[PDB]
Design a protein around this nucleic acid. Structure first.
Lengths: 254, 85, 51, 554
DNA sequence: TTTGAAAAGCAAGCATAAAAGATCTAAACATAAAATCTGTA
DNA sequence: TACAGATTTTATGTTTAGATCTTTTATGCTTGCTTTTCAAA
């Protein structure tokens, strides 16, 4: 079904491809004419093609991308948050960078255990901001709010993070926590309170932020204040990876 | 064409607010004053769509129709002829 | 005190809010065609209510 | 499994600077550490001045609000372009409590919550230096309880975000305190858009109430360019005598600084910082901004510095001016490199000179020092000074021609590679579209080699058919179009390459094998497109048609 | 220079998505008296 | 053991964040007729 349009790109292509199709010019082709495929053969063919089709170019490209790892480390030490984007899964890249590379480098440069890496699976729709902050408060042990700081039915998480920001401004600038956020534009983490929480955590220089995004409209999530607080350096890392872990929360039959 | 000062939009805004305040106009599909305190508490924690759009675009409805105005406005008024279509 | 991008985005949002989306190719399309085709003709008769 | 969890902490297993070795890895580690420490002193020298400038912004801005706030109606202050981050101070004024109340739109869902939070904060502040009802009778009983007069200063934060009906009713509520002789009320409005947008959302009687005494205050950092010029001058005095700034870089700074208005200074700081990190990470000649490293000259330094176009122009001018060939071959250098890296480059001091002459000798304040520096770089300072109609008599004193010095290309901040664009302000959706459409600029073409050679990756192959289609796509026709591009024989040979997998070998000899494989790959790529936001199902319970959402080049 | 004819436009009718909100629940936030547990004595 | 003091238990009130269902209105599809520019003689 190639379009009979003169244009493909820009607003010219946008206005030229949104024309009106008559009823007799439409196709009444349905999913009932498709060959029937069960879940098991779907799983079998997908894990065969995701492990043997274009695996060697993906391997060589991934070996090119780890030459960027010292530059990523240098951008994290100067206070910038890393945002990775591209076509394909970036989950293995983020855990391999943060765990196998970045945490021993930060721990050895700050001279004995390595830096803890808190992983946020934003592709999970059950990612909850209060339990993430519970894990953060166990990892960092911040001072609790006094009675005048609780305000009047305020959000205790946001007030505690603001107190944390005012505390950590007069501390040595040594990274105490590595916050990895797979799929920062995921279904529950893209909400306003979660983004506000994560940007205010990104204000703190002692927390390293390594995040990834999958949606094409992800920079719509951040206004001027959130872009100032996040302090992103953007890095395009396209690899055409399968993304099989993130697909377990959706139904592939539909 | 057949004199009366034509007032500007910024001055007619005050007359519009006074006509809303005197209950000549009413916001469209407005419930108004709730029956019990629980319904009023539920309404007070809701942000109505009429309170965020600009004032010149709010839908309103008449508490008095044009026929009633023709019934009450005396014949010697200079706007009586416009109480008919 | 808005940016130039914010100002033109406000203007474009006003245009999108008050022009119906089936005649934009009759106003904004200007680029030379290699492939034969027709743009939108435009609105035939004017409306008498200011939108 | 941790992959199926919401969140989990990994205590990595621990089995020293991020700077790498340049000169194709032949740089010494001493030069790497010296580059690291050199970058740290330059970064510290810039950021100490930046912190002092930000502190001075805070101090002077609190001073202006404190002046305007002091010396039977509201005392109204409108802070235009505020962004509501400043801590407002009230003095100690004996026999009178000065209580400051911050209200955000999140703390203001209705008038009742505004009054309850305001009176709780008022009672808490009065007690801090028998329970009561948190209502306006606390205001009328304030001199009976605490004995002194009351001065309330309300600070509404993000006034463009609070519901205006609630704010109007709260101001009308606070009007009731005017009948008490021991109460004065000041209101501070953090206006972000403009004042005309605010008064079109308030009722006319409230505007008439607020008109009795109000003061406007432009509190933006863009007003007068007074704070941006100090940051840019601090960066200039950091790199004075060490690094040059290109006209391309300053033009980029101006163009990006125009696109952001509420947050301008930290964008400028971020851009200058990232340029400094990029220079000290990519350039091995950075050690030569310190004169003590001139004994660290090696061969690879000489062949890198011999490709400078200023050196190219200098030696071709030398063969233009000198007839004998013996002196030319002697230069084609190590001693000639040293004697020119210690030049003063007085463009920074002259920029400071015209800045202080424009500010303190001609009483002209509305100039951008970044734009003035760009015009001094391109050589058109007179065309920048002929606007105010007062630099006509001083046109000849402030003349400066640019001196294109030798070996300045090894010590400069530029953008001719687009690295600052790709890292700070990328074309995000355009990069996604171009990686989907092309894909040979992402995946290498190594020379299952056959199927990798003649079949595209599935997402790019789907995007090639997606882009050429209409707004509304039939899913079955899309699958038919996708199946035609695939090789029917090489795919069936590819799934028979592994003899260990038996169920795939069993499915391969089915007469409906290739269509099943094509439909599985098509459905996986379609759900990848749906998760990326490229397509949308325009239904709930059919999933037979999709709508295109994203167009390349928009 | 015409021409004609298929693309574009338009409107009546109708099935359906969706906006606005009425109503409600539950979690976070908050208080408080009686009982019960701790640390000295 | 005795007993003041701290903590828990049980009990309830305050405010916010979000879910579900109902009612009215926008929106897109279909079908038949009418205008209009561009590919061709």
């Amino acid at each position: 079904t190639k379009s009979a349009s003169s244009f493909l790109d820009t607003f010219e292509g946008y206005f030229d491809q949104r024309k009106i199709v008559r009823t007799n010019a439409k196709s009444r082709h349905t999913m009932s004419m498709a060959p029937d495929v069960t879940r098991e053969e779907f799983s079998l063919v997908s894990n065969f093609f995701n492990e043997n089709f274009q695996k060697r170019p993906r391997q060589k490209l991934f070996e090119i991308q780890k030459k960027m790892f010292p530059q990523y480390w240098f951008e994290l030490t100067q206070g910038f948050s890393l945002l990775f984007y591209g076509v394909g899964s970036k989950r293995n890249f983020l855990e391999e960078f943060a765990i196998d590379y970045l945490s021993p480098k930060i721990a050895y440069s700050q001279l004995v255990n390595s830096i803890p890496c808190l992983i946020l699976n934003g592709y999970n729709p059950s990612c909850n901001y209060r339990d993430v902050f519970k894990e953060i408060t166990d990892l960092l042990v911040p001072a609790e709010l006094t009675r005048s700081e609780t305000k009047y039915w305020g959000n205790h998480v946001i007030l505690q993070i603001q107190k944390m920001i005012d505390f950590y401004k007069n501390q040595p600038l040594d990274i105490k926590l590595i916050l990895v956020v797979h799929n920062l534009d995921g279904p529950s983490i893209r909400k306003n309170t979660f983004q506000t929480m994560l940007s205010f955590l990104s204000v703190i220089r002692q927390i390293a932020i390594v995040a990834s995004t999958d949606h094409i409209y992800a920079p719509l999530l951040w206004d001027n204040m959130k872009a100032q607080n996040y302090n992103f350096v953007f890095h395009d890392i396209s690899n055409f990876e399968p993304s099989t872990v993130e697909s377990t929360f959706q139904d592939v039959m539909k | 064409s057949r004199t009366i000062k034509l007032w500007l939009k910024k001055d007619v805004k005050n007359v519009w607010e006074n006509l809303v305040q005197l209950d000549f106009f009413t916001e469209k599909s407005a419930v108004g004053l709730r029956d019990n305190a629980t319904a009023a508490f539920y309404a007070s924690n809701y942000q109505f769509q009429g309170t965020m759009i600009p004032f010149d675009l709010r839908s309103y409805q008449m508490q008095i129709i044009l026929q009633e105005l023709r019934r009450i406005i005396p014949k010697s008024n200079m706007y009586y002829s416009w109480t008919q279509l | 005190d808005l940016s130039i991008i914010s100002k033109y985005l406000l203007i474009a949002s006003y245009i999108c809010s008050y022009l119906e989306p089936r005649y934009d190719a009759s106003i904004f399309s200007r680029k030379t065609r290699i492939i034969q085709g027709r743009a939108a003709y435009g609105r035939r008769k004017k409306k008498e209510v200011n939108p | 499994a941790d992959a199926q969890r919401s969140h989990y902490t990994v205590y990595p297993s621990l089995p020293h600077i991020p700077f790498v070795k340049l000169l194709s890895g032949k740089e010494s580690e001493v030069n790497v550490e010296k580059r690291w420490e050199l970058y740290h002193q330059l970064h510290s020298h810039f950021h100490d001045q930046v912190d002092h400038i930000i502190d001075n912004i805070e101090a002077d801005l609190k001073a202006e609000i404190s002046d305007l706030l002091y010396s039977r109606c509201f005392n109204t202050i409108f802070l235009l372009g505020s962004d509501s981050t400043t801590k407002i101070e009230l003095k100690d004024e004996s026999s009178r409590y000065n209580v400051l109340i911050e209200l955000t739109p999140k703390e203001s869902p209705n008038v009742r919550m505004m009054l309850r939070r305001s009176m709780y904060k008022l009672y808490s502040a009065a007690d801090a230096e028998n329970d009561v009802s948190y209502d306006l009778s606390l205001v009328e009983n304030f001199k009976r309880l605490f004995g002194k007069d009351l001065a309330m200063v309300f600070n509404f934060k993000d006034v463009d975000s609070i519901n205006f009906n609630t704010l109007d009713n709260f101001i009308i509520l606070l009007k009731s305190a005017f009948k008490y002789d021991h109460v004065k009320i000041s209101l501070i409005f953090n206006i972000n858009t403009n004042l005309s947008n605010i008064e079109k959302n308030l009722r006319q009687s409230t505007i008439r109430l607020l008109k009795r005494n109000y003061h406007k205050l432009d509190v933006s950092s863009n007003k007068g360019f007074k704070y941006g010029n100090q940051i840019f001058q601090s960066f200039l005095d950091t790199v004075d005598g060490k690094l040059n700034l290109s006209d391309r870089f300053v033009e980029f700074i101006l163009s990006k600084m125009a696109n952001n208005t509420n947050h301008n200074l930290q964008l400028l700081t971020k851009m200058l910082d990232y340029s400094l990190m990029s220079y000290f990470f990519q350039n091995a000649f950075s050690v030569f901004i310190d004169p003590v490293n001139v004994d660290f000259l090696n061969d690879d330094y000489l062949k890198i510095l011999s490709r400078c176009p200023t050196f190219m122009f200098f030696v071709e001018g030398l063969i233009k001016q000198h007839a004998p060939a013996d002196e030319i071959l002697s230069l084609l250098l190590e001693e000639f490199f040293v004697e020119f890296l210690v030049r003063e480059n007085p463009i920074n001091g002259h920029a400071k000179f015209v800045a202080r002459f424009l500010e303190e000798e001609l009483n002209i304040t509305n100039f951008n020092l970044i734009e003035l520096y760009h015009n001094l770089l391109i050589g058109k300072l007179d065309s920048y000074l002929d606007r105010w109609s007062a630099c006509k008599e001083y046109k000849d004193r402030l003349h400066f021609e640019p001196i294109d010095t030798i070996f300045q290309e090894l010590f400069t901040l530029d953008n001719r590679s687009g690295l600052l664009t790709q890292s700070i302000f990328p074309s995000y959706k355009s990069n996604i579209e171009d990686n989907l459409l092309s894909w040979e600029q992402v995946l290498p073409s190594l020379d299952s080699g056959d199927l990798d050679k003649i079949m595209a990756p599935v997402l790019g192959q789907l995007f090639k058919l997606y882009r050429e289609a209409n707004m509304t796509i039939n899913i079955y026709d899309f699958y038919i179009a996708f199946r035609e591009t695939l090789p029917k024989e090489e795919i069936l040979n590819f799934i028979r390459k592994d003899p260990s997998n038996t169920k795939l070998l069993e499915l391969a000899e089915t007469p409906d094998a290739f269509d099943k494989v094509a439909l599985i790959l098509f459905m996986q790529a379609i759900f990848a497109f749906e998760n990326m936001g490229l397509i949308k199902f325009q239904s709930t319970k059919s999933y037979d048609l999709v709508e295109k959402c994203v167009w390349r080049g928009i």
